Enzyme design. Sequence first.
Site, PDB file in Angstrom:
ATOM      1  N   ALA A  22      31.162  39.942  29.080  1.00 44.14           N
ATOM      2  CA  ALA A  22      31.157  41.355  28.684  1.00 44.14           C
ATOM      3  C   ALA A  22      32.502  42.044  28.931  1.00 44.14           C
ATOM      4  O   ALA A  22      32.992  42.792  28.076  1.00 44.14           O
ATOM      5  CB  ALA A  22      30.038  42.107  29.398  1.00 44.14           C
ATOM      6  N   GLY A  24      35.550  40.498  29.707  1.00 45.07           N
ATOM      7  CA  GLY A  24      36.759  39.785  29.297  1.00 45.07           C
ATOM      8  C   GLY A  24      36.659  38.269  29.280  1.00 45.07           C
ATOM      9  O   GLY A  24      35.566  37.712  29.430  1.00 45.07           O
ATOM     10  N   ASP A 137      28.906  44.488  38.993  1.00 42.85           N
ATOM     11  CA  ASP A 137      28.578  43.310  38.181  1.00 42.85           C
ATOM     12  C   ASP A 137      28.228  42.082  39.062  1.00 42.85           C
ATOM     13  O   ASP A 137      28.560  40.942  38.737  1.00 42.85           O
ATOM     14  CB  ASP A 137      29.750  43.024  37.212  1.00 42.85           C
ATOM     15  CG  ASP A 137      29.439  41.961  36.156  1.00 42.85           C
ATOM     16  OD1 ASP A 137      30.406  41.333  35.655  1.00 42.85           O
ATOM     17  OD2 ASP A 137      28.266  41.750  35.802  1.00 42.85           O
ATOM     18  N   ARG A 141      26.582  34.217  38.381  1.00 46.05           N
ATOM     19  CA  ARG A 141      27.844  33.863  37.695  1.00 46.05           C
ATOM     20  C   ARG A 141      29.132  34.348  38.381  1.00 46.05           C
ATOM     21  O   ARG A 141      30.190  33.730  38.189  1.00 46.05           O
ATOM     22  CB  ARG A 141      27.833  34.313  36.236  1.00 46.05           C
ATOM     23  CG  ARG A 141      28.062  35.810  36.034  1.00 46.05           C
ATOM     24  CD  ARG A 141      27.718  36.256  34.607  1.00 46.05           C
ATOM     25  NE  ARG A 141      27.658  37.704  34.614  1.00 46.05           N
ATOM     26  CZ  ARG A 141      26.522  38.388  34.675  1.00 46.05           C
ATOM     27  NH1 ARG A 141      25.362  37.740  34.644  1.00 46.05           N
ATOM     28  NH2 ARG A 141      26.544  39.718  34.737  1.00 46.05           N
ATOM     29  N   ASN A 142      29.032  35.425  39.177  1.00 46.56           N
ATOM     30  CA  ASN A 142      30.166  36.047  39.860  1.00 46.56           C
ATOM     31  C   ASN A 142      30.250  35.716  41.352  1.00 46.56           C
ATOM     32  O   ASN A 142      30.836  36.460  42.150  1.00 46.56           O
ATOM     33  CB  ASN A 142      30.208  37.549  39.591  1.00 46.56           C
ATOM     34  CG  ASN A 142      30.682  37.863  38.174  1.00 46.56           C
ATOM     35  OD1 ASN A 142      31.483  37.113  37.602  1.00 46.56           O
ATOM     36  ND2 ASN A 142      30.184  38.961  37.593  1.00 46.56           N
ATOM     37  N   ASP A 155      34.916  39.442  40.715  1.00 54.67           N
ATOM     38  CA  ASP A 155      34.665  40.289  39.514  1.00 54.67           C
ATOM     39  C   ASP A 155      34.208  41.721  39.866  1.00 54.67           C
ATOM     40  O   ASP A 155      33.687  42.443  39.006  1.00 54.67           O
ATOM     41  CB  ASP A 155      33.665  39.599  38.559  1.00 54.67           C
ATOM     42  CG  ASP A 155      33.978  39.842  37.074  1.00 54.67           C
ATOM     43  OD1 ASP A 155      35.174  39.923  36.702  1.00 54.67           O
ATOM     44  OD2 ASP A 155      33.021  39.923  36.261  1.00 54.67           O
TER      45      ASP A 155
HETATM   46  C1  W32 Z   1      29.765  31.184  32.238  1.00 60.62           C
HETATM   47  S1  W32 Z   1      31.480  31.060  31.799  1.00 60.62           S
HETATM   48  O1  W32 Z   1      31.690  29.748  31.213  1.00 60.62           O
HETATM   49  O2  W32 Z   1      31.839  32.277  31.095  1.00 60.62           O
HETATM   50  C2  W32 Z   1      32.273  31.103  33.389  1.00 60.62           C
HETATM   51  C3  W32 Z   1      33.767  31.306  33.232  1.00 60.62           C
HETATM   52  N1  W32 Z   1      34.453  31.218  34.504  1.00 60.62           N
HETATM   53  C4  W32 Z   1      34.490  30.025  35.189  1.00 60.62           C
HETATM   54  O3  W32 Z   1      34.090  28.965  34.729  1.00 60.62           O
HETATM   55  C5  W32 Z   1      35.125  30.053  36.540  1.00 60.62           C
HETATM   56  C6  W32 Z   1      36.015  31.020  36.782  1.00 60.62           C
HETATM   57  C7  W32 Z   1      36.833  31.212  37.977  1.00 60.62           C
HETATM   58  C8  W32 Z   1      37.216  30.170  38.814  1.00 60.62           C
HETATM   59  N2  W32 Z   1      38.001  30.389  39.878  1.00 60.62           N
HETATM   60  C9  W32 Z   1      38.401  31.637  40.089  1.00 60.62           C
HETATM   61  N3  W32 Z   1      38.101  32.704  39.343  1.00 60.62           N
HETATM   62  C10 W32 Z   1      37.314  32.477  38.279  1.00 60.62           C
HETATM   63  N4  W32 Z   1      36.942  33.559  37.435  1.00 60.62           N
HETATM   64  C11 W32 Z   1      37.382  34.880  37.537  1.00 60.62           C
HETATM   65  C12 W32 Z   1      36.507  35.952  37.614  1.00 60.62           C
HETATM   66  C13 W32 Z   1      36.980  37.242  37.684  1.00 60.62           C
HETATM   67  C14 W32 Z   1      38.343  37.469  37.670  1.00 60.62           C
HETATM   68  O4  W32 Z   1      38.874  38.739  37.716  1.00 60.62           O
HETATM   69  C15 W32 Z   1      38.657  39.544  38.820  1.00 60.62           C
HETATM   70  C16 W32 Z   1      38.201  40.830  38.645  1.00 60.62           C
HETATM   71  C17 W32 Z   1      37.987  41.682  39.711  1.00 60.62           C
HETATM   72  C18 W32 Z   1      38.245  41.203  40.987  1.00 60.62           C
HETATM   73  C19 W32 Z   1      38.698  39.913  41.140  1.00 60.62           C
HETATM   74  C20 W32 Z   1      38.976  39.388  42.515  1.00 60.62           C
HETATM   75  F1  W32 Z   1      39.682  38.250  42.474  1.00 60.62           F
HETATM   76  F2  W32 Z   1      39.594  40.333  43.268  1.00 60.62           F
HETATM   77  F3  W32 Z   1      37.854  39.059  43.190  1.00 60.62           F
HETATM   78  C21 W32 Z   1      38.923  39.068  40.080  1.00 60.62           C
HETATM   79  C22 W32 Z   1      39.232  36.408  37.600  1.00 60.62           C
HETATM   80 CL1  W32 Z   1      40.939  36.714  37.573  1.00 60.62          CL
HETATM   81  C23 W32 Z   1      38.744  35.120  37.526  1.00 60.62           C
HETATM   82  N5  W32 Z   1      36.862  28.826  38.734  1.00 60.62           N
HETATM   83  C24 W32 Z   1      36.020  28.207  37.735  1.00 60.62           C
HETATM   84  C25 W32 Z   1      34.750  28.987  37.480  1.00 60.62           C
END
Ligand code: W32
Length: 317
Positions: A22, A24, A137, A141-142, A155
């Site tokens: 949703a 990004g 959120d 998943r988060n 997230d």
């Molecule tokens: C169902 S799917 O297929 O859509 C899933 C798609 N994602 C994945 O597979 C994965 C993602 C994955 C990961 N490692 C590390 N961050 C990840 N995501 C991620 C999620 C959110 C983000 O932004 C923020 C926003 C606000 C605060 C923060 C903060 F950092 F402060 F907490 C970060 C950012 Cl930058 C990266 N490892 C692999 C797992």
Amino acid sequence: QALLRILKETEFKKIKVLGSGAFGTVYKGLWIPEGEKVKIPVAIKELREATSPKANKEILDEAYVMASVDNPHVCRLLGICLTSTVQLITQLMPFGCLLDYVREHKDNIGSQYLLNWCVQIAKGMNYLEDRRLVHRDLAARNVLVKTPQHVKITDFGLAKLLGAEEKEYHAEGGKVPIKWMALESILHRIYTHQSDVWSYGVTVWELMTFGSKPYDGIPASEISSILEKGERLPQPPICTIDVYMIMVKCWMIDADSRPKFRELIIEFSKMARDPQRYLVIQGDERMHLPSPTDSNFYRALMDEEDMDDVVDADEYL
Ligand SMILES: CS(=O)(=O)CCNC(=O)C1=Cc2c(ncnc2Nc2ccc(Oc3cccc(C(F)(F)F)c3)c(Cl)c2)NCC1
């Protein structure tokens, strides 16, 4: 030496797509700090744009809070790159999300692990409440797997950054995760630490069902009427009533009556002391979690040749 590093596009590279949501789209990538001589595995989130976007300084101000967090169960922002798009950079967690982990490892997950995750998630959410940062959120998943015995929340604060508390976001086609949202958030765009509590209850439900989809098949447009009639997610088969009652409390219409995160830490910690009293899992005693790096998710991310010679962000910082 900034807490929130302002990264140049030349400093980092998107290597592969992970997925969209949703708010990004996320990529696996590498961060090469400019003057230094290392490659650091990162996740890179490029956000959805708006017709009337916020000024860079306002975005920078909100992102600073995301970089300022310092707790074992909360991910932190390492960097940001503002261009025509907003890009957020964070340490890559190559064991992936807890949602994927419970779906993959269902037959090997015992009561102790599930209850410990609930404690850990509640500690990170209590830390965000101390920081006065509503997540907005929270969902399985988060939650990301650092190790099978250590998970971290990510997230948080993005829904705020993107203006989902105002009408403009919704008028411009923006969507929000309705099946995780407290009723007051759905009806009046009210988001508090007590609306995060509701989403915590949904997360726990996702965990205890080994990653079932909440209100599966039910259209998002029908959710508020369903909740208003008193209908809730069903008791997971593995949960005793004591555990389900907690989830049920998290979904009370009166947000002030819902448990507090400090309370949920205590309650789930007490349960984690005698896990088999609270969760009923066949074979519970004889359950062994596979070596973390033997997981499909880890190899799928790290074995690529583009990931040449790398240093983990924890070891670098
Ligand atoms: C169902 S799917 O297929 O859509 C899933 C798609 N994602 C994945 O597979 C994965 C993602 C994955 C990961 N490692 C590390 N961050 C990840 N995501 C991620 C999620 C959110 C983000 O932004 C923020 C926003 C606000 C605060 C923060 C903060 F950092 F402060 F907490 C970060 C950012 Cl930058 C990266 N490892 C692999 C797992």
